[PDB]
Design a protein around this motif. Structure first.
Motif, PDB file in Angstrom:
ATOM      1  N   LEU A 180       0.695  -1.213  -0.127  1.00 13.70           N
ATOM      2  CA  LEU A 180       0.160  -0.011   0.127  1.00 13.70           C
ATOM      3  C   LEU A 180       0.838   1.100   0.104  1.00 13.70           C
ATOM      4  O   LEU A 180       1.844   1.352   0.859  1.00 13.70           O
ATOM      5  CB  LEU A 180      -0.802   0.025   1.404  1.00 13.70           C
ATOM      6  CG  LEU A 180      -2.280   1.200   1.248  1.00 13.70           C
ATOM      7  CD1 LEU A 180      -3.224   0.297   2.222  1.00 13.70           C
ATOM      8  CD2 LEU A 180      -1.538   2.387   1.960  1.00 13.70           C
ATOM      9  N   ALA A 181       0.737   2.336  -0.949  1.00 18.16           N
ATOM     10  CA  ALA A 181       1.426   3.541  -0.990  1.00 18.16           C
ATOM     11  C   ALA A 181       0.691   4.643  -0.517  1.00 18.16           C
ATOM     12  O   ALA A 181       0.156   5.297  -0.993  1.00 18.16           O
ATOM     13  CB  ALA A 181       1.558   3.634  -2.480  1.00 18.16           C
ATOM     14  N   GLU A 238       1.155   8.321  -1.806  1.00 15.67           N
ATOM     15  CA  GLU A 238       0.190   8.505  -2.965  1.00 15.67           C
ATOM     16  C   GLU A 238      -1.118   8.353  -2.501  1.00 15.67           C
ATOM     17  O   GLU A 238      -1.517   7.287  -2.527  1.00 15.67           O
ATOM     18  CB  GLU A 238       0.484   7.839  -4.155  1.00 15.67           C
ATOM     19  CG  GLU A 238      -0.219   7.822  -5.550  1.00 15.67           C
ATOM     20  CD  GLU A 238      -0.390   9.349  -5.997  1.00 15.67           C
ATOM     21  OE1 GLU A 238       0.430  10.369  -5.207  1.00 15.67           O
ATOM     22  OE2 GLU A 238      -1.393   9.813  -6.796  1.00 15.67           O
ATOM     23  N   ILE A 239      -1.757   9.312  -2.492  1.00  9.29           N
ATOM     24  CA  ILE A 239      -3.260   9.452  -2.287  1.00  9.29           C
ATOM     25  C   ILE A 239      -3.979   9.831  -3.456  1.00  9.29           C
ATOM     26  O   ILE A 239      -3.616  10.638  -3.986  1.00  9.29           O
ATOM     27  CB  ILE A 239      -3.557  10.289  -0.772  1.00  9.29           C
ATOM     28  CG1 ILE A 239      -3.009   9.836   0.169  1.00  9.29           C
ATOM     29  CG2 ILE A 239      -5.035  10.478  -0.525  1.00  9.29           C
ATOM     30  CD1 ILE A 239      -2.276  11.125   0.850  1.00  9.29           C
ATOM     31  N   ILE A 240      -4.980   8.912  -3.687  1.00 10.24           N
ATOM     32  CA  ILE A 240      -5.980   9.408  -4.788  1.00 10.24           C
ATOM     33  C   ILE A 240      -7.127  10.637  -4.433  1.00 10.24           C
ATOM     34  O   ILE A 240      -7.901  10.221  -3.732  1.00 10.24           O
ATOM     35  CB  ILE A 240      -6.794   8.264  -5.244  1.00 10.24           C
ATOM     36  CG1 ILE A 240      -5.674   7.001  -5.538  1.00 10.24           C
ATOM     37  CG2 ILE A 240      -7.732   8.523  -6.354  1.00 10.24           C
ATOM     38  CD1 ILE A 240      -4.735   7.533  -6.567  1.00 10.24           C
ATOM     39  N   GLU A 241      -6.549  11.717  -4.666  1.00  8.73           N
ATOM     40  CA  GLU A 241      -7.588  12.910  -4.494  1.00  8.73           C
ATOM     41  C   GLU A 241      -8.936  12.924  -5.279  1.00  8.73           C
ATOM     42  O   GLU A 241      -8.455  12.802  -6.535  1.00  8.73           O
ATOM     43  CB  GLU A 241      -6.579  14.107  -4.702  1.00  8.73           C
ATOM     44  CG  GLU A 241      -5.597  14.346  -3.608  1.00  8.73           C
ATOM     45  CD  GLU A 241      -6.134  14.392  -2.013  1.00  8.73           C
ATOM     46  OE1 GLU A 241      -7.547  14.942  -1.986  1.00  8.73           O
ATOM     47  OE2 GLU A 241      -5.517  14.178  -1.072  1.00  8.73           O
ATOM     48  N   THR A 242      -9.847  13.046  -4.594  1.00 12.18           N
ATOM     49  CA  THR A 242     -11.287  12.749  -5.441  1.00 12.18           C
ATOM     50  C   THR A 242     -12.206  13.859  -5.386  1.00 12.18           C
ATOM     51  O   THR A 242     -12.809  13.993  -6.580  1.00 12.18           O
ATOM     52  CB  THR A 242     -11.904  11.536  -4.765  1.00 12.18           C
ATOM     53  OG1 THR A 242     -12.222  11.508  -3.312  1.00 12.18           O
ATOM     54  CG2 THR A 242     -10.983  10.084  -5.165  1.00 12.18           C
ATOM     55  N   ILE A 243     -12.016  14.366  -4.400  1.00 16.14           N
ATOM     56  CA  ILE A 243     -13.195  15.656  -4.112  1.00 16.14           C
ATOM     57  C   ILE A 243     -12.572  16.914  -4.089  1.00 16.14           C
ATOM     58  O   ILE A 243     -11.332  17.028  -3.321  1.00 16.14           O
ATOM     59  CB  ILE A 243     -14.101  15.277  -2.994  1.00 16.14           C
ATOM     60  CG1 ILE A 243     -13.244  15.349  -1.768  1.00 16.14           C
ATOM     61  CG2 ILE A 243     -14.713  14.138  -3.330  1.00 16.14           C
ATOM     62  CD1 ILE A 243     -14.202  14.972  -0.320  1.00 16.14           C
ATOM     63  N   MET A 290      -3.615   1.856  -3.387  1.00 18.51           N
ATOM     64  CA  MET A 290      -3.535   3.458  -2.965  1.00 18.51           C
ATOM     65  C   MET A 290      -4.461   4.062  -2.283  1.00 18.51           C
ATOM     66  O   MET A 290      -5.725   3.525  -2.462  1.00 18.51           O
ATOM     67  CB  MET A 290      -3.197   4.174  -4.545  1.00 18.51           C
ATOM     68  CG  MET A 290      -2.432   3.471  -5.598  1.00 18.51           C
ATOM     69  SD  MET A 290      -2.539   4.737  -7.014  1.00 18.51           S
ATOM     70  CE  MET A 290      -0.937   4.363  -7.411  1.00 18.51           C
ATOM     71  N   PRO A 291      -4.358   4.952  -1.208  1.00 16.25           N
ATOM     72  CA  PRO A 291      -5.221   5.184  -0.415  1.00 16.25           C
ATOM     73  C   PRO A 291      -6.304   6.281  -1.064  1.00 16.25           C
ATOM     74  O   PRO A 291      -5.530   7.130  -2.111  1.00 16.25           O
ATOM     75  CB  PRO A 291      -4.527   5.833   0.927  1.00 16.25           C
ATOM     76  CG  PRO A 291      -3.114   5.336   0.710  1.00 16.25           C
ATOM     77  CD  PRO A 291      -3.064   4.836  -0.797  1.00 16.25           C
ATOM     78  N   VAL A 292      -7.403   6.174  -0.901  1.00 15.94           N
ATOM     79  CA  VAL A 292      -8.363   7.280  -1.253  1.00 15.94           C
ATOM     80  C   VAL A 292      -8.381   8.405  -0.242  1.00 15.94           C
ATOM     81  O   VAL A 292      -8.087   8.133   0.986  1.00 15.94           O
ATOM     82  CB  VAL A 292      -9.567   6.572  -1.767  1.00 15.94           C
ATOM     83  CG1 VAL A 292     -10.672   7.811  -2.297  1.00 15.94           C
ATOM     84  CG2 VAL A 292      -9.394   5.459  -2.408  1.00 15.94           C
ATOM     85  N   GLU A 293      -8.894   9.754  -0.541  1.00 14.71           N
ATOM     86  CA  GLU A 293      -8.922  10.471   0.201  1.00 14.71           C
ATOM     87  C   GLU A 293      -9.727  10.455   1.189  1.00 14.71           C
ATOM     88  O   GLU A 293     -11.112   9.704   0.811  1.00 14.71           O
ATOM     89  CB  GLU A 293      -9.041  11.902  -0.784  1.00 14.71           C
ATOM     90  CG  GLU A 293      -9.382  13.226   0.055  1.00 14.71           C
ATOM     91  CD  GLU A 293     -10.056  14.220  -0.674  1.00 14.71           C
ATOM     92  OE1 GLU A 293      -9.798  15.217  -0.317  1.00 14.71           O
ATOM     93  OE2 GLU A 293     -10.564  14.107  -1.785  1.00 14.71           O
ATOM     94  N   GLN A 294      -9.715  10.867   2.386  1.00 12.70           N
ATOM     95  CA  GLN A 294     -10.716  10.229   3.465  1.00 12.70           C
ATOM     96  C   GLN A 294     -11.912  11.569   3.357  1.00 12.70           C
ATOM     97  O   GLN A 294     -11.806  12.657   2.929  1.00 12.70           O
ATOM     98  CB  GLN A 294     -10.044  10.541   4.848  1.00 12.70           C
ATOM     99  CG  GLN A 294      -9.388   8.979   5.301  1.00 12.70           C
ATOM    100  CD  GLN A 294      -9.330   9.079   6.786  1.00 12.70           C
ATOM    101  OE1 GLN A 294     -10.440   9.304   7.559  1.00 12.70           O
ATOM    102  NE2 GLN A 294      -8.396   8.697   7.241  1.00 12.70           N
ATOM    103  N   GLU A 295     -13.076  10.906   3.935  1.00 12.98           N
ATOM    104  CA  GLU A 295     -14.067  11.908   4.029  1.00 12.98           C
ATOM    105  C   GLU A 295     -14.809  11.670   5.420  1.00 12.98           C
ATOM    106  O   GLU A 295     -14.796  10.401   6.155  1.00 12.98           O
ATOM    107  CB  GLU A 295     -15.286  11.196   3.168  1.00 12.98           C
ATOM    108  CG  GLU A 295     -14.984  11.387   1.632  1.00 12.98           C
ATOM    109  CD  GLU A 295     -16.042  11.882   0.777  1.00 12.98           C
ATOM    110  OE1 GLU A 295     -17.026  12.516   1.241  1.00 12.98           O
ATOM    111  OE2 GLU A 295     -15.883  11.511  -0.298  1.00 12.98           O
TER     112      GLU A 295
END
Lengths: 53, 53
Positions: A10-11, A14-19, B48-53
């Motif tokens: 798990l990286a 690198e965070i997958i920015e979504t919003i 890959m982590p996703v952005e937290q909510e």
């Protein structure tokens, strides 16, 4: 072939920015902070006069 | 007439240059390289982590 131990990577870097949310209305509306000591004795209320007619 | 030895000429340096291609989407795309050693012991997979909510 090569059979070996499997891992799960798990990286965290690198965070997958979504919003991405914008807040224009709260920026346009003004902010006021009446004195807290007087606010406590009132019921967190201020009265303002209206222009007279 | 004039019966003499014949030749065949190949203008090697004169190529015809028939194709031109362009690659917009892969140019615009991100490119990621994880660590190789950790990738091998995974199924070539990174989480890959996703952005937290």
């Amino acid at each position: 072939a090569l059979n070996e131990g499997q891992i799960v990577t798990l990286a965290v870097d690198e965070i997958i920015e979504t919003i991405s949310a914008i807040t224009p209305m709260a920026q346009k509306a003004k902010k006021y902070t009446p004195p807290a000591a007087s606010m406590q004795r009132s019921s967190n209320t201020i009265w303002m006069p209206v222009e007279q007619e």
